[PDB]
């Protein structure tokens, strides 16, 4: 019903095995996400409208 191009496979590509940033998940002290980025990872779905 979906593909390896959708959000469910994009989770696997994240840096869950590395350390990039100089600080942990507590970084949200002055930043919070928007729905425009949430509607990006599901758009790859090979279905109609």
């Amino acid at each position: 019903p979906l593909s390896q191009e959708t959000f469910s496979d994009l989770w696997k590509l994240l840096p869950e095995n590395n350390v990039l940033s100089p600080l942990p998940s507590q970084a949200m002290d002055d930043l919070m996400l928007s729905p425009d980025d949430i509607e990006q990872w599901f758009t790859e779905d090979p279905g109609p409208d």
Binding site: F7, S8, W11, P15, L20, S25, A27, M32, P35, F42
Partner: protein, 59 residues
């Protein structure tokens, strides 16, 4: 990486995403993500390195 996750949270994110614009939608996304630290911590760590808090000269 300290514990497991469930695919049900991904479906709950999709049902939440389709709702109209409201502060309750933001709270539900945070509620859903906090249940599965594994993927949300990797996501924020990847995002903070590319985060953009403003917009260009438009009208």
């Amino acid at each position: 990486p300290n514990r497991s996750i469930s695919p049900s949270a991904l479906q709950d994110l999709l049902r939440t995403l389709k709702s109209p614009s409201s502060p309750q939608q933001q709270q539900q996304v945070l509620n859903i993500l906090k249940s599965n630290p594994q993927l949300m911590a990797a996501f924020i760590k990847q995002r903070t390195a590319k985060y953009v808090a403003n917009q260009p000269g438009m009208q």
